[PDB]
Design a protein around this ligand. Sequence first.
Ligand SMILES: N[C@@H](CC(=O)O)C(=O)O
Length: 481
Amino acid sequence: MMTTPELSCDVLIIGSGAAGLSLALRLAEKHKVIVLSKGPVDSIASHVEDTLIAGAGICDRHAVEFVASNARTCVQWLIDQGVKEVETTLVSRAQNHPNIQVLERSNAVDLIISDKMGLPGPRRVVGAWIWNRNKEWVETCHAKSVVLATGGASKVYQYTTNPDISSGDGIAMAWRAGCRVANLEFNQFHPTALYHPQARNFLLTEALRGEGAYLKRPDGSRFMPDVDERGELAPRDIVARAIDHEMKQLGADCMFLDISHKPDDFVRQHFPMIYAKLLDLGMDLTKEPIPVVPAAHYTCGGVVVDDYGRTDVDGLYAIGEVSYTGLHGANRMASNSLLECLVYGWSAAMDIDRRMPSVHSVDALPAWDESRVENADERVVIQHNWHELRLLMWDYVGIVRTTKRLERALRRITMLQQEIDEYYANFRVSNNLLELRNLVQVAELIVRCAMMRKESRGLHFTLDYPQQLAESGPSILSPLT
Ligand SMILES: N[C@@H](CC(=O)O)C(=O)O
């Protein structure tokens, strides 16, 4: 049962995006930090008002003012660290810091909570079990504090702009550890991702439509003027809903983006990189329409945190897209996702620093169960379930929602949960199984938040409740009820 941990640190940071790496640089000035990477590593007043408007009336004003007031000093700190040229600096710094150990190709399995090993005092995180992909075994990491910085949950959807950072593992682990989550119905979709077998999540920018690109049905006709007087210039969420409608109504695999009516020099001049990438895949931006589908892009909800980035579990923090701070409300304003992870990283660091002397090391932790069950055919079904989840979320908790579609999603999600419990119990850990467990867990939370909201607001659009409620707030789920 109890054994000496393979790994020990003062702060375990799960996730290696901008949020995780910038917090790592802050804390590693004083503390031993491990970073787990899944793969290779205007006035304040107007910002506040713009954020509140973007959030469609359910922003937490306290959080909005917190981020807007501290934005400039936290961005200056980032610049002084030596500044996606931000990622180049952060990755280089994190890999060359004496007090940071970057562990690549390692997946957190679950958080180790003190009350499950008879430690006295209020329950707190004391470490995590970690799947080492190169060694194919589960290790134990002792940590005095743990920070979730794993990104969002967009991978629950079959189309996603950034799959490698959107598996929802931080949200699922926090839920299993007893944390509230919130606002998981507010998922931002990019309207025009390239639909091609070798697209590698390539995005067609809205600048194409800004310069006059048309959005076409498979038969060549333009659908945007039929639904919005601004046509292809409508706001992002309106374009995404229209594409979703056309695809589902027509049973079409994709819509099409076409600038071919513009002269060829106009196209090559304004979008040289887009023109270059598409001809490499066999598509001519100056002659033919480009196949596009919407794609899940950003999770405005997540693990509930306070001003310090503290979750409901002592010692456990969450910053960046994995967290729900209240900053965003029902939608996202562009620049706020970076400001959020800098400001809450600063305040998390302050709290972690002040808390550290009171935390005493644990010299023995519960080892991972043997988990030796193996059936090769059942292992293949894990992949079927993974695809089934991502498709049902696209259909039933997608861009356009209805009450009856949400019911179908919850029914299937519940079935998958019960099957996972029944069929994969004590299965040997694998990346696919961990991802399936987490995707299904977070899908349940997403659909339960979407079902709670009896109105259309921001990123939550339901045909059954087209209007906004006069008074509203966030959708909060508790695992303790
Ligand atoms: N904090 C990053 C994403 C992340 O790593 O959570 C951003 O949204 O800018």
